[PDB]
């Protein structure tokens, strides 16, 4: 019996855990989403992204750099 699916609860309010299928699915979805986002900017015919900041400054960036795209996103 896992921590989450047990008659007694062992966690704080808001704390959870994902077991084999759920953890693997979450990891694969996140990684594949990141790769799909960063791709299409690859090779001589790759296109640029627009990074529209949601902060008070609302900075605007146009880039083809994968690292620049990946660092300026809020990923959970």
């Amino acid at each position: 019996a896992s921590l989450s699916l047990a008659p007694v609860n062992i966690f704080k309010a808001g704390a959870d855990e994902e077991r084999a299928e759920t953890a693997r699915l979450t990891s694969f979805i996140g990684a594949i989403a990141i790769g799909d986002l960063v791709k299409s900017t690859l090779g001589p015919k790759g296109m640029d992204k627009i990074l529209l900041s949601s902060g008070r400054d609302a900075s605007l960036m146009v880039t083809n750099d994968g690292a620049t795209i990946l660092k300026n996103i809020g990923v959970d």
Binding site: L25, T26, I29, G30, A33, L37, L52, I73
Partner: protein, 33 residues
């Protein structure tokens, strides 16, 4: 007698929708601020 007891795809990274809806977002945000 009578007398008796009776008586999948979780990662979305929404792209342009926030840009389209920023008008209403700021409309509510000014009043909320």
């Amino acid at each position: 007698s009578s007398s008796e007891d009776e008586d999948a795809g979780e990662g979305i990274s929404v792209n342009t929708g926030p840009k389209g809806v920023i008008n209403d977002w700021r409309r509510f945000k000014q009043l909320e601020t």
